[PDB]
Design a protein around this ligand. Structure first.
Ligand SMILES: [Ca+2]
Ligand SMILES: [Ca+2]
Ligand SMILES: [Ca+2]
Ligand SMILES: [Ca+2]
Ligand SMILES: [Ca+2]
Ligand SMILES: [Ca+2]
Ligand SMILES: [Ca+2]
Ligand SMILES: [Ca+2]
Ligand SMILES: [Ca+2]
Ligand SMILES: [Ca+2]
Ligand SMILES: [Ca+2]
Ligand SMILES: [Ca+2]
Ligand SMILES: [Ca+2]
Ligand SMILES: [Ca+2]
Ligand SMILES: [Ca+2]
Ligand SMILES: [Ca+2]
Ligand SMILES: [Ca+2]
Ligand SMILES: [Ca+2]
Ligand SMILES: [Ca+2]
Ligand SMILES: [Ca+2]
Ligand SMILES: [Ca+2]
Ligand SMILES: [Ca+2]
Ligand SMILES: [Ca+2]
Ligand SMILES: [Ca+2]
Ligand SMILES: [Ca+2]
Ligand SMILES: [Ca+2]
Ligand SMILES: [Ca+2]
Ligand SMILES: [Ca+2]
Ligand SMILES: [Ca+2]
Ligand SMILES: [Ca+2]
Ligand SMILES: [Ca+2]
Ligand SMILES: [Ca+2]
Ligand SMILES: [Ca+2]
Ligand SMILES: [Ca+2]
Ligand SMILES: [Ca+2]
Ligand SMILES: [Ca+2]
Ligand SMILES: [Ca+2]
Ligand SMILES: [Ca+2]
Ligand SMILES: [Ca+2]
Ligand SMILES: [Ca+2]
Ligand SMILES: [Ca+2]
Ligand SMILES: [Ca+2]
Ligand SMILES: [Ca+2]
Ligand SMILES: [Ca+2]
Ligand SMILES: [Ca+2]
Ligand SMILES: [Ca+2]
Ligand SMILES: [Ca+2]
Ligand SMILES: [Ca+2]
Ligand SMILES: [Ca+2]
Ligand SMILES: [Ca+2]
Ligand SMILES: [Fe+3]
Ligand SMILES: [Fe+3]
Ligand SMILES: [Fe+3]
Ligand SMILES: [Fe+3]
Ligand SMILES: [Fe+3]
Ligand SMILES: [Fe+3]
Ligand SMILES: [Fe+3]
Ligand SMILES: [Fe+3]
Ligand SMILES: [Fe+3]
Ligand SMILES: [Fe+3]
Ligand SMILES: [Fe+3]
Ligand SMILES: [Fe+3]
Lengths: 172, 172, 172, 172, 172, 172
């Protein structure tokens, strides 16, 4: 056992490894979305920038969980990063809806992790998840919902003018 | 159901609406206290400023709960803001004692809200309440207790000289 | 009688208490409107900011009337702040129309207050109302009318694109 | 009962007094270690500085718990600060190992305190401990483990050259 | 066919998709190496920082190839990012040797890509690879070889003092 | 015998260890006094700050004696730090009187130490004590006497107004 390990359950260690993979997966989904908007036949530069920023932030989220694993004396076991479920994200609205779904899935996983930490009487882990992950997820979900609403109200996806103007005025 | 809503119980949503009202009520109590000290026959300008500041801070507290409700996909339902239980707050000491009582009541409500969040396995809400409300309440209660103690020790309310000097040296 | 009171009729004192309540009510209506636009299914951030600013300004208006009451040696008697007449404000256009109606009601009350002051030969009160309230109300009403006109001309509320663009270009 | 006391169990108050003593004890252990490295026959100035810094930080930790006790309306009861379990700390490596053991003991106590707070439905106390103590302890333990590992890998304690170079390059 | 596509062979498009995956794979290998050095039982902070920097640079390399694919009117098809071939990288020297091997494999792939571009008379692609990838690879390989040589000459891995000092003086 | 030791009697070494303990004890007494004034039912913030400053200065005094012991080639032997003789310090005046008594006791010990140094023909130790301790003690005693006098003349402890005003105007 690691000399630093204290009050850190095997199940929590495993759940953190799973969460690392999920954050890396989210980073990869956002990378895919970004470059879809960089296609010459899509050509929404601020959608591309928005999703690239999200991709880089998800990598930061994963790295912080890797740091946590080592802080607690767990051992990192990486797994493959699955490719995303689409190659073509169809539209700005559709990508935002897929991102909303992704973020809710990530949130669900984090909530299960918090419950595990609580069940194993690991208050350090529970508060790590609260403090660094749970409000970030609520903010991310709220932002994506706001974006979806605006795009729908403006007439996306059928209105390419709507997506163009949203790209300029919200994402610019 | 709101597209953002996740792990947010109906009971929690209702409790947040009640808490919004209570913070707005506290803002109104402090507004009343402030202008009592602005009366020509009371004339304690720093008591007036202290309570006006508290009034504005309570409004900020309410607004942050309104933001939370929307972040979580709940729906804000406002209720009347009841007028305070006094029109004439009698003295600096008496107002400070009433403020202490108010803050303990607000704290009790927040503790019940945290317990509800915990019971509904809503760690985001529990940590929102911890992080933004519970230590602020402990600090507020401690400050008011300190003020009450000083005013009592100095001879308030019968000593108008005591209230005058406290106004200058503590609240100035 | 207060040592400062001079030329200040009982009826004027009562009317000022009523006006304090009306300004606090207007503040609360605007607070409600603000957070309606913060909902994830409405999501017009600059409408939200506009109405929050109006809410805070109405509180300032109320506080100045409280100060006036004490300046003149009247006594403040607060009343409940009624909740607004809607929970759901429907659209940007509908909220602007409701705000226009509110401001005209507040203006009507202020005009009646000025008439009372004049009838009681209270030129200080009449000029307080002129100087600090009446042109502010005319400006507020004109602005809201301008906003209503633009939203109607642009195609609101059926055009969510109209409300989106107004939010960006007028209220941003 | 103190006028500020609310939701603060007798057992929690007692546990906070015990924790104050433990933090003061840790401060004293680190003070002892510091001046061991200041001996002419040990002469590792950066080990001395490192442990003196830790001593001063532990005093800050104790003072913050004293402040907490008063914030909550508990009453501070101090106890003797026991002298450390060694006078001669043998080597840089041995002192780091003893510090690691100390910090794990302090952590164990803090975890028991959090569990108590949770059991007594004291979310303010639980989050005080989370926010100000638990991650600090995880960081402290990780740092000490890292230091122990490096010293072992370098050849300490038999290599006085190892301890010398660690003093310069890690602790300098 | 994309409106921008000109002189861009199907085989080149496919090879660029493969290269994107390989750069993302290299990023993941370096991420794994980084956090191995962050373990409490390894504890070489500058090895950790070095490899994290390499990880982030490999992501940049992948993103630039994604941009290229779109510039030329090809279509990005992402694939899974395979987990690395080790979980435990054993030592600073062993990780540097594995990184050298990785970089030579990436170089081999880039050289094959250049040959393909040349064979398909695609001078834009050939010079993209020359200009942005081939000298970077030669520099990376030379640096890693230099690091391997130094660690071997110093006595790594058996000398943990060697790895410690290399971490401080070369990688710091 | 330590390689640095010269003209340093065993009895002097022992007396320095005793003095270290006494300075640490004084630090602890002042810490206790400080947080007594931080109680909600005492609430004299500048008394609290004054005594906390004294606590930190006494720790500095102890650390300098530890440094001296090592400078001379003596060996530090720490002892328990006894808890203070009161938990409740009663009033500002009573705490100042207890501090005066403490400082006179510390002075008596330092004078005995100087006499010992003189008797053992240790002029370095005698002048260390003169230069760094004896005038500091005379200044401390004079200040505390001045404070006691003022509090008595003002009407402390029965006048809580006296203690309040002293806290503001002398200790602020
Ligand atoms: Ca464990
Ligand atoms: Ca386990
Ligand atoms: Ca595992
Ligand atoms: Ca796959
Ligand atoms: Ca698929
Ligand atoms: Ca599919
Ligand atoms: Ca499909
Ligand atoms: Ca927030
Ligand atoms: Ca739900
Ligand atoms: Ca429900
Ligand atoms: Ca409700
Ligand atoms: Ca009422
Ligand atoms: Ca009543
Ligand atoms: Ca009544
Ligand atoms: Ca009554
Ligand atoms: Ca928390
Ligand atoms: Ca605090
Ligand atoms: Ca009159
Ligand atoms: Ca009249
Ligand atoms: Ca009236
Ligand atoms: Ca009503
Ligand atoms: Ca109604
Ligand atoms: Ca209705
Ligand atoms: Ca209706
Ligand atoms: Ca004008
Ligand atoms: Ca209690
Ligand atoms: Ca109890
Ligand atoms: Ca106790
Ligand atoms: Ca002992
Ligand atoms: Ca012993
Ligand atoms: Ca022993
Ligand atoms: Ca022994
Ligand atoms: Ca950290
Ligand atoms: Ca072509
Ligand atoms: Ca082709
Ligand atoms: Ca292909
Ligand atoms: Ca694989
Ligand atoms: Ca394998
Ligand atoms: Ca293998
Ligand atoms: Ca193998
Ligand atoms: Ca070329
Ligand atoms: Ca070169
Ligand atoms: Ca000697
Ligand atoms: Ca001797
Ligand atoms: Ca001795
Ligand atoms: Ca004792
Ligand atoms: Ca005793
Ligand atoms: Ca006693
Ligand atoms: Ca006694
Ligand atoms: Ca002097
Ligand atoms: Fe995100
Ligand atoms: Fe994430
Ligand atoms: Fe407050
Ligand atoms: Fe509040
Ligand atoms: Fe207005
Ligand atoms: Fe108004
Ligand atoms: Fe520490
Ligand atoms: Fe500590
Ligand atoms: Fe590289
Ligand atoms: Fe590369
Ligand atoms: Fe002193
Ligand atoms: Fe001293």
């Amino acid at each position: 056992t690691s000399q630093v390990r204290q009050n850190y359950h095997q199940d929590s260690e495993a759940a953190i490894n799973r969460q690392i993979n999920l954050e890396l997966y989210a980073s990869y989904v956002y990378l895919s979305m970004s470059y879809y908007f960089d296609r010459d036949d899509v050509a929404l530069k601020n959608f591309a920038k928005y999703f690239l920023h999200q991709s880089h932030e998800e990598r930061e989220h994963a790295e912080k969980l890797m740091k946590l694993q080592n802080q607690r004396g767990g051992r990192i076991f990486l797994q493959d990063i699955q490719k995303p479920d689409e190659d073509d994200w169809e539209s700005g609205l559709n990508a935002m809806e897929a991102a909303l779904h992704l973020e809710k899935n990530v949130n669900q996983s984090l909530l299960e992790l918090h419950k595990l930490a609580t069940d194993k009487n690991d208050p350090h882990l529970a508060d790590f998840i609260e403090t660094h992950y749970l409000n970030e997820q609520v903010k991310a979900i709220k932002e994506l919902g706001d974006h979806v609403t605006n795009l729908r109200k403006m007439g996306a996806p059928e209105s390419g003018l709507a997506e163009y103007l949203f790209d300029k005025h919200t994402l610019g």
